[PDB]
Amino acid sequence: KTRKESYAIYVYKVLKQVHPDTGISSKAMSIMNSFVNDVFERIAGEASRLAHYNKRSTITSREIQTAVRLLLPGELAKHAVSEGTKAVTKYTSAK
Amino acid sequence: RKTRKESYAIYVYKVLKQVHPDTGISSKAMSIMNSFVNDVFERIAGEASRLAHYNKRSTITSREIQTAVRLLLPGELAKHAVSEGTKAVTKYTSAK
Amino acid sequence: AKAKTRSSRAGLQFPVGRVHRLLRKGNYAERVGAGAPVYLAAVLEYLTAEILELAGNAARDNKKTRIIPRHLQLAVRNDEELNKLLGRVTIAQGGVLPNIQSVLLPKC
Amino acid sequence: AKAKTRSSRAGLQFPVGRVHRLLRKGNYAERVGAGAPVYLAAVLEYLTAEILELAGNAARDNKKTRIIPRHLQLAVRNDEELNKLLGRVTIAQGGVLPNIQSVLLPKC
Amino acid sequence: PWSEERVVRKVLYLSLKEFKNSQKRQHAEGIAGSL
Amino acid sequence: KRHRKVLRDNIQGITKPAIRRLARRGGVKRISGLIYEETRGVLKVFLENVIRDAVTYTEHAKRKTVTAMDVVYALKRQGRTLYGFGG
Amino acid sequence: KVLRDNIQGITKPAIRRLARRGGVKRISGLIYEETRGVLKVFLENVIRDAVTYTEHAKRKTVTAMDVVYALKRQGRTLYGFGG
Amino acid sequence: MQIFVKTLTGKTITLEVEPSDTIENVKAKIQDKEGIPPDQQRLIFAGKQLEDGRTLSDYNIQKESTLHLVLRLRGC
Amino acid sequence: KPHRYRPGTVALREIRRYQKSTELLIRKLPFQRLVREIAQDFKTDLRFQSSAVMALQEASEAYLVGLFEDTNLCAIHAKRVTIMPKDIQLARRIRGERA
């Protein structure tokens, strides 16, 4: 018992959207789990400070945007920011 | 002339004379000590922050700080400082 | 009635509800905006997609059906822009990149 | 009834109230205990005291009355434990420990 | 004002193999978007 | 007789051919003979550092059993994160 | 003689000076290039993030505290200038 | 545009090349017209050893220029 | 009559062999013994999960491997082909480890 969370299912889904026909071993799932669990904090912690400096109290997108501009090196930043911008401005249009 | 700032300068100075009661101190060195204190305070705090969440408590206690020291200060300084803090508490307990 | 997933309303796959829960309970700030968890989840999804895709080709070029760590290693270490992001991580069961210095070879 | 500071009741020199407030407004947890800020201020006091005298000595050795960065730098790079603690800090106006490799010295 | 001759004398003297970058990974800049 | 059979000189449990294997994986061709003690000490220092904090954590959580998470946290604190063990 | 792309502003004797405080004795002829590039690289890697902070704060002038932060980022803390 | 590639053996060859051609492509042309493998060649002009990734326009080379090629063996 | 290979040629095959596989390189039981040995001095009477030891190993090995590689580059810098403790002690200091 004592349920645990994970990201397995979502990983598998995303996998199916690129090589729709390729399996994934067990451990190589646990890895890709831990990896997300890492990057998540490595961004959220940074954004926390970044807000705390200018003495705000809320976290919004804008900083997450900046915070990304700091960690991801170069072209990955160029892409990810476009991705975010897009995949939010849609959502706000249709709640 | 408004919007007061803060520092530790007072306390640096006070504890200074308790050791070299004849010595002065420039401004730059004052600022440096200030920054240094700020650094260390944060390090130790942030450490204990995780230490709780791991065991999923919700309040920082002394016991937290105790170990959190043992993970930053190398060797000797740790053994000294833990003694120090242990003492400083005991008194405060009885001496409200 | 007839509720809808926020992810749908975003058109993604990551549990935006789950994320937005995590931020509140992480002591990350005092109060969380609305748009943030969206933006965050989008970034995560993009990243993991990129890496998985690369690994897929990696393993196929070895003519196998599934994906195992050794692939992931051979996947990251070959793309620098990734490789920097993972300067200090260690993938168990990872081996190393095939490499030999130029001098230690025979004369010809 | 008449009041008095906490640090008094601790017999210390560092401002408890400020430390406590700082803990609260830093999100470092949800609830702050009672004993902690005491314990913490104690450690800060100890450390500061340490570094101070270590600098004061060296400063006196060069016939001065008020301490100067150039002293502190000399003070920390000469006690390995302190040195280790600040392994990567760079103190402004700090110069460098004097040191020369043997080989560069003349034959005799 | 350029010591090309001196650097060429250095090329003749040192004369050792050198290592550098090999491949162009622009695909990480490309198909990644289409991913 | 219950426990505490304190063993000594296990560092010699590291055979020379073992170290040869590692070095090979590294990509070295010719090897001196003194190294077989250099590494025997280097590795020990490295271990000690980790195992200390490893213990420290459990101790704080007051059990008698060193889980894996513990080691993970330790290895992280020193800037050597490790994937694949339940981060 | 005014045409000077500021990278040239790093005079060779200057480099020699730092080299001394390090503790080097003799010096080849080429290093006066390696340094000019290395310094350059190191510089962008910091001025970029400094800029970034200023931007996010909507400001228009590079406060010291920014440069400090950016320096703590790379793993190079710096005492004294405030912080 | 035409260039002159003077070699250590007293031979100075002409190539067909554009300012947008890279030094890797120029070395490929050296291979195709002389059999000299591109991994063995190092071209010199304007006091610098030519970089394969850059083009002729990047070095600001004009027509009728006389470039220098040294045979530098890597490997073996 | 009996065939014997050129000196040092076996290695050139050893490397290309090992740089491909992924499994461990040290037999467990002695390693586990060693760990349990060191552990006593901090708080004797301990008890371990299995995977914990596996982890400890995994890291140790990855460390040593990465160390050797740089040791090698050092050794080349001085135009040798072997390695010597004086080499290790260099990298182990430039890194800042034994600084």
From Swiss-Prot, chains C, D:
Modified sites of kind N6-succinyllysine: 84
Cross-link (Glycyl lysine isopeptide (Lys-Gly) (interchain with G-Cter in ubiquitin)): 2, 4, 108
Record-annotated membrane-spanning stretches: none
UniProt entry tagged with the keyword Transmembrane helix: no
N6-glutaryllysine modifications at: 84, 107
GO BP field: heterochromatin formation
Location (main, coarse): nucleus
N6-(2-hydroxyisobutyryl)lysine modifications at: 25, 63-64, 84, 107
Residue list for modification N5-methylglutamine: 93
Localization per record: Nucleus; Chromosome
Post-translational modification note: Following DNA double-strand breaks (DSBs), it is ubiquitinated through 'Lys-63' linkage of ubiquitin moieties, leading to the recruitment of repair proteins to sites of DNA damage. H2AK119Ub and ionizing radiation-induced 'Lys-63'-linked ubiquitination are distinct events. Glutamine methylation at Gln-93 (H2AQ104me) by FBL is specifically dedicated to polymerase I. It is present at 35S ribosomal DNA locus and impairs binding of the FACT complex.
Keywords annotated in UniProt: Acetylation, Chromosome, DNA-binding, Hydroxylation, Isopeptide bond, Methylation, Nucleosome core, Nucleus, Phosphoprotein, Ubl conjugation
Gene Ontology cellular-component annotations: nucleosome; nucleus
MF GO annotations: DNA binding; protein heterodimerization activity; structural constituent of chromatin
Purpose: Core component of nucleosome. Nucleosomes wrap and compact DNA into chromatin, limiting DNA accessibility to the cellular machineries which require DNA as a template. Histones thereby play a central role in transcription regulation, DNA repair, DNA replication and chromosomal stability. DNA accessibility is regulated via a complex set of post-translational modifications of histones, also called histone code, and nucleosome remodeling.
Protein name: Histone H2A type 1
From Swiss-Prot, chain E:
Organs and tissues of expression: During embryogenesis, predominantly expressed in neurons and particularly in dorsal root ganglion cells.
Coiled coil (residue ranges): none
Compartments (UniProt record): Nucleus
Disulfide bonds: none
Disease cited in the entry: Developmental delay with variable intellectual disability and dysmorphic facies: An autosomal dominant disorder characterized by various degrees of developmental delay, mild to moderate intellectual disability, learning difficulties, hypotonia, autistic features, behavior abnormalities, and dysmorphic facial features apparent from infancy or early childhood.
Known role: Regulator of histone methyltransferase complexes that plays an essential role in embryonic development, including heart and liver development, neural tube fusion process and hematopoiesis. Acts as an accessory subunit for the core PRC2 (Polycomb repressive complex 2) complex, which mediates histone H3K27 (H3K27me3) trimethylation on chromatin. Binds DNA and mediates the recruitment of the PRC2 complex to target genes in embryonic stem cells, thereby playing a key role in stem cell differentiation and normal embryonic development.
Domain-level remarks: The ARID domain is required to target the PRC2 complex to its target genes.
Name under which the protein is recorded: Protein Jumonji
The organism of origin for this protein: Homo sapiens
Organismal lineage: Eukaryota, Metazoa, Chordata, Craniata, Vertebrata
Designated gene of the protein: JARID2
Curated annotation (Swiss-Prot), chain G:
Subcellular location: Nucleus; Chromosome
Alphabetized UniProt keyword annotations: Acetylation, Chromosome, Citrullination, DNA-binding, Hydroxylation, Isopeptide bond, Methylation, Nucleosome core, Nucleus, Phosphoprotein, Ubl conjugation
Main location as per UniProt: nucleus
N6,N6-dimethyllysine PTM sites in chain numbering: 1
Positions bearing Phosphoserine: 28
Any one GO cellular component localisation term in the record: nucleus
Post-translational modification N6-methyllysine, affected residues: 1
UniProt GO molecular function: DNA binding; protein heterodimerization activity; structural constituent of chromatin
N6-butyryllysine: residues bearing it: 12, 25, 58, 60, 72
Record-listed N6-propionyllysine modification sites: 12, 25, 58, 60, 72
Sites bearing N6-lactoyllysine, chain numbering: 12, 58, 72
List of residues that carry N6-succinyllysine: 12, 58, 72
Cross-link (Glycyl lysine isopeptide (Lys-Gly) (interchain with G-Cter in UFM1)): 12
Highest rank taxon of the organism: Eukaryota
Sites of N6,N6,N6-trimethyllysine modification: 1
Keyword Phosphoprotein listed: yes
Function: Core component of nucleosome. Nucleosomes wrap and compact DNA into chromatin, limiting DNA accessibility to the cellular machineries which require DNA as a template. Histones thereby play a central role in transcription regulation, DNA repair, DNA replication and chromosomal stability. DNA accessibility is regulated via a complex set of post-translational modifications of histones, also called histone code, and nucleosome remodeling.
Protein name per the record: Histone H4
Species this chain originates from: Xenopus laevis
From Swiss-Prot, chain I:
Entry's Gene Ontology cellular component terms: nucleoplasm; nucleosome
Modified residues (N6-glutaryllysine): 20, 43, 79, 86
Superkingdom of source: Eukaryota
Residues modified as N6-succinyllysine: 20, 43, 86
Modified residues (Phosphotyrosine): 5
N6,N6-dimethyllysine: residues carrying this PTM: 43
PTM annotation (N6-methyllysine): residues: 1, 20, 28, 43, 86
Positions carrying Phosphothreonine: 44, 71
List of residues that carry N6-crotonyllysine: 20
Biological role: Core component of nucleosome. Nucleosomes wrap and compact DNA into chromatin, limiting DNA accessibility to the cellular machineries which require DNA as a template. Histones thereby play a central role in transcription regulation, DNA repair, DNA replication and chromosomal stability. DNA accessibility is regulated via a complex set of post-translational modifications of histones, also called histone code, and nucleosome remodeling.
Protein name: Histone H3.2
Source organism per UniProt: Xenopus laevis (African clawed frog)
Parent-protein residues present: 38 to 136 of 136
